[PDB]
Each structure stands twice: as C-alpha cells, then as structure tokens.
Write a protein that binds this ligand. Structure first.
Ligand code: HEM
Length: 136
C-alpha cells in the first residue's frame, strides 16, 4: 500500500462518502444476518427502514469510522484494534466480514466508474481485512 494507491482510493471514496445510507443498505442486502444483529432493525423490511432516522444515525456512525480509516492509510492498526474490541463480543464472523466487503464493493461498482480504482481498493481492503482476520 503506497501513496499512489492511497491517493486513488481516497479520491474514489470522496465521491461516495456523502451517502452513508446507501452504503449500509448495500451491506445489509448482501447479508441479512448482519442486519439481524441490530435490535433496531431485526425483523423489519430493509426497503422500509432504509429511509428512516434510525438507519441514517447508524449509517453515519459506521461509515463515519470507515471514513476515519480511509483517511489515515496506512496507519490503521489502532483503529482496527478498537473495531475488534467492540465487535468481537458481538460474535461477528469471517463470513459476515467478507459479505460486508462484497456489499461495499458492489455499492462502489454501481455508483462509480470503479474500473480505475479497483486494484488500489483491492490492496486497501486486503490490508484492512488482513489485519482484522489476524485479530478475530
Ligand atoms: C460485517 C459484520 C458486522 C456486523 C455483524 C456488525 C454489527 C454491528 C452491531 C450489532 C453494532 C451495534 C449497533 C447498535 O447497537 O447500535 C454495530 C455498530 C458499529 N459498527 Fe459494526 N458490524 C459489522 C461490521 C463493521 C465494520 C466493517 C465496521 C467498520 C467501519 C463497523 C463499524 C461499526 C461502528 C463504528 C459502529 C458504531 C459503534 C459501535 O457500536 O460499535 N462494523 N455493528
């Protein structure tokens, strides 16, 4: 992960960072078992809650932290540690983590011309999920 790739990803992310709700929707759609861990959304129709105030509040927190991480590449270890601390006890699995990744990338491919940032994003996400998977 070198500066050229970091700048590419951060330029790419800047285009979509104002749409937290959309990104969280894509994740929940890729894997409903992630959605079922939120007491506030479990048992509800994703298409119906996507435009409510609770969804936006959650989305802003979750994508807000992801935004922190993208902004500080590559010095992400401390934040990954915090992530593991809050999520390890919720029983998040590797399967779910990989569906989060798949959902995010599906979002990016449907909303931007992703072809030019694809390798840089690959490097970033392989590094990030690489660290998470070493810790939980
Ligand atoms: C893919 C598996 C994941 C599952 C099952 C999951 C589940 C959850 C749950 C249950 C909460 C608590 C919601 C609440 O009570 O209000 C939460 C909050 C949060 N998640 Fe995740 N999450 C996942 C992935 C991630 C990832 C990849 C990030 C990195 C951006 C992340 C960042 C956050 C943040 C910042 C919060 C709010 C702070 C907190 O309560 O931990 N989550 N998530």
């Amino acid at each position: 992960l070198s500066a050229d790739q970091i700048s590419t990803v951060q330029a790419s992310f800047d285009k979509v960072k104002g749409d937290p709700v959309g990104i969280l929707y894509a994740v929940f759609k890729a894997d409903p078992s992630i959605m079922a861990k939120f007491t506030q959304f479990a048992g509800k129709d994703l298409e119906s809650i996507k435009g409510t105030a609770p969804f936006e509040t959650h989305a802003n927190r979750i994508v807000g932290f992801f935004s922190k991480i993208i902004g500080e590449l590559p010095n992400i270890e401390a934040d990954v540690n915090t992530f593991v601390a809050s999520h390890k006890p919720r029983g998040v699995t590797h399967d779910q983590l990989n569906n989060f990744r798949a959902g995010f990338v599906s979002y990016m491919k449907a909303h931007t011309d992703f072809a030019g940032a694809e390798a840089a994003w690959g490097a970033t996400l392989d590094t990030f999920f690489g660290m998470i998977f070493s810790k939980m």
